[PDB]
């Protein structure tokens, strides 16, 4: 939604660049300027509808992480990807949150070759191929029980908390808490904090930072003091017990097993069965 100023037109001939001024219905050229145009954009002068297309292509998506070597070259490579994305809107680049590095996709080996040539010639940034990364979610296996203690004197006053948490993993049902404290071993005011004490800590994994998912946590016993023993003691004890449970349980990893529809003509079918 802006008016672009067409500065000059030019036709790239076999060897020469013929600078022309007028273009009629049937001829094609290029414009100097409009340095922020993206392929697929339509140009309008006499208030006509835009013929912008968005459903004419298919995704060749194959994720491949590209490991960086020098941070300055990585910073320039980010700008290079920004300047090459408009070249092919169907060219895909992901930015993994756990590993903030570029994830190239393409249509095969020659696709990667042309992309790396584009990076290494115009931008002069050359990067070596690494290896892709996967989310690799986490669960674990049942454990007996976990204790948690927190005693301090810092600040001229102590802070005290004792909790017993039994940490139950699942495969389908996410985070859920059940309370079983009876007998005044904890005041009700610190019931809801512990409800938030566990789940907030549940998103940390003891292998590579992958959040722990589909777990059930429960409280059985606990201990506190007189007017001391403020709210944060049990909140931090819950997280400490969660981390200890996740560490000593020898956790298990999960990866998505993608359903693959291999469509082939009636020539490589038996070969497809053999290859699989």
């Amino acid at each position: 939604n802006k008016k672009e100023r067409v500065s000059r037109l030019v036709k790239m001939h076999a060897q020469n660049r013929n600078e022309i001024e007028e273009i009629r219905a049937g001829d094609i050229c290029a414009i100097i300027g409009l340095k922020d145009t993206t392929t697929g954009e339509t140009l309008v002068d006499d208030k006509i509808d835009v013929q912008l297309e968005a459903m004419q292509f298919a995704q060749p998506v194959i994720s491949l992480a590209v490991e960086p070597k020098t941070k300055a070259d990585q910073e320039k490579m980010s700008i290079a990807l920004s300047k090459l994305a408009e070249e092919d809107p169907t060219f895909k680049t992901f930015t993994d949150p756990e590993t903030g590095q570029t994830i190239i996709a393409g249509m095969g080996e020659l696709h990667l070759d042309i992309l790396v040539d584009r990076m290494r010639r115009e931008f002069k940034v050359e990067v070596n191929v690494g290896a892709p990364q996967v989310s690799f979610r986490e669960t674990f296996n049942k454990e007996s029980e976990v204790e948690g203690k927190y005693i301090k004197q810092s600040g001229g006053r102590g802070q005290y908390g004792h909790v017993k948490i039994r940490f139950e993993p699942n495969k389908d049902k996410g985070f859920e808490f059940v309370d079983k404290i009876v007998g005044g071993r904890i005041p009700r005011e610190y019931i809801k904090p512990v409800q938030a004490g566990l789940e907030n800590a549940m998103a940390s994994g003891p292998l590579a930072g992958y959040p722990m998912i589909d777990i059930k946590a429960t409280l059985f016993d606990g201990s506190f003091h007189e007017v001391d023993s403020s709210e944060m003691a049990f909140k931090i004890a819950a997280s400490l017990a969660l981390k200890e449970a996740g560490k000593v349980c020898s956790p298990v990893l999960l990866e998505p097993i993608m359903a693959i529809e291999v469509t082939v003509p009636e020539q490589y079918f038996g070969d497809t069965m053999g290859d699989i």
Partner: protein, 67 residues
């Protein structure tokens, strides 16, 4: 950028340290540190953020906290 090499202090809790990053510099003076009267800017292309911070948003380059 010059052939000389300079000692600086890394402000705040936490670190963005990889011993390989080009980073900018800041002035100031810290007399406790022997030989260190130069500083690294926190909140630039490197040393990008300090978390939990909601004050002193002139150093540490932390985005303004809003709900």
């Amino acid at each position: 950028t010059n052939g000389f090499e300079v000692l600086t202090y890394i402000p705040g809790e936490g670190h963005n340290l990889q011993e390989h990053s080009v980073t900018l510099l800041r002035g100031g003076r810290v007399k406790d540190l022997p030989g260190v009267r130069y500083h690294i800017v926190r909140g630039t292309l490197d040393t990008v953020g300090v978390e939990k911070r909601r004050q002193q948003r002139s150093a540490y380059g932390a985005k303004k906290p809003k709900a």
